Amino acid sequence: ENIEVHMLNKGAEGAMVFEPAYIKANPGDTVTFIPVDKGHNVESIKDMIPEGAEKFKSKINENYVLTVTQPGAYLVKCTPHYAMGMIALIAVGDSPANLDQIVSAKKPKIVQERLEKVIA
Ligand SMILES: [Co+2]
């Protein structure tokens, strides 16, 4: 199945957001990232995707379709706005093995706050 995500300058959680910022998926699903506002992209964060998953980075302002294969958690960022909190968490399958690791990993404060919200 397909899950659509909007990339926005402003949304419910404040400035520079993915909506939704929590995406539940299964292997073989697609996540479609739509640049509703300009100035955004999607990029996998180093050491915060499952072992065996391929790294990815879209171009600024492109519609990007991600196919997810490996189970686990994926933290993705908008490259220009990572420091402003623009992230999403994709959970593929049940009980992602690397979720606690991602929560503990070094990242900007605003990112950590937003991440803890989405998990909660
Ligand atoms: Co952005």
From Swiss-Prot:
It comes from the Bacteria. GO terms for molecular function: copper ion binding; electron transfer activity. Cu cation binds at residues 40, 78, 81, 86. Binds 1 copper ion per subunit. It is found in: Periplasm. Residues 5-93 form the Plastocyanin-like domain. One of its GO terms (cellular component) is periplasmic space. This is Pseudoazurin. The chain holds residues 24 to 143 of 146 of the full protein.
